[PDB]
Amino acid sequence: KVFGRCELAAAMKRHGLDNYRGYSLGNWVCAAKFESNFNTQATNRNTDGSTDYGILQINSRWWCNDGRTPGSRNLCNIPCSALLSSDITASVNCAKKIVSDGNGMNAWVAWRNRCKGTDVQAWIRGCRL
Ligand SMILES: [Cl-]
Ligand SMILES: [Cl-]
Ligand code: NA
C-alpha cells in the first residue's frame, strides 16, 4: 500500500509515534517519505547483502529475519515480510525499538540527511489529526 501523507501521519499517531522518545510526528512522516516514498512494499538491497524493508526501511542485518542475511540478528523478532504489510503495526513497533537503542532517529540515513534540522512540522501541516 502507498500511503498518503496525512493518512500515514494519522496512522502513526494512532500507533503512538507522535513525540515518541521526543520525536514529533513530522519527523516520522519525513523519514517514511524519503526512505520508502510512503510505500509499504519497498525493498532495497545493501552492499553487505542485507536488505531494507517496508515503509521505514528496517534492515535485515539487525532487526528482522529474511532467511538470507547470514549472521544477522532478529531484534524485532519478526520475519522481514511482516514489515511489508499494509498494516503498519509491525513496522511501527519495530521502529520504536530502533529509536530507543541510543542513536535516536540517526539510524535512518535519510532522516539524518534530509529531515534532521529541517522544518519537519511541514510534513503534518494541513492534516486532521
Ligand atoms: Cl512535527
Ligand atoms: Cl540520504
Ligand atoms: Na495501518
- DSSP codes of every residue in the chain: -B--HHHHHHHHHHTT-TTBTTB-HHHHHHHHHHHHTTBTT-EEE-TTS-EEETTTTEETTTT-B-S-STT---TT-SBGGGGGSSSTHHHHHHHHHHHTSSSGGGGSHHHHHHTTTS-GGGGTTT---
Find the 119 Cα to ligand 3 centroid distance in Å: 25
Find the 71 Cα to ligand 3 centroid distance in Å: 31
In a domain, 10, yes or no: yes
In a domain, 97, yes or no: yes
Find the 113 Cα to ligand 2 centroid distance in Å: 5
Instruction: Quote the number of domains for the chain.
Output: 1
Query: What CATH number should be reported for the domain holding residue 52?
Result: 1.10.530.10
| Strand 51-53 relative to strand 58-59, pairing | antiparallel
Catalytic residue chosen out of the listed positions 7, 18, 48, 52: 52
Resolution (angstroms) stands at 1.8
For residues 124 and 67, what is the distance between their CA atoms, to the nearest angstrom? 36
For residues 126 and 68, what is the distance between their CA atoms, to the nearest angstrom? 42
Note the Cα 45 to chain centre separation in Å.
16
Catalytic residue chosen out of the listed positions 35, 48, 66, 87: 35
Task: Answer whether 34's CB lies under 8 Å from 17's CB.
Answer: no
Q: Is 101 annotated as a binding residue?
A: yes
In a domain, 75, yes or no: yes
In a domain, 129, yes or no: no
What residue numbers bound the domain in which 97 lies? 5-124
In a domain, 108, yes or no: yes
- For this PDB entry, the determination method is X-ray
Grid cell locating 2: 502507498
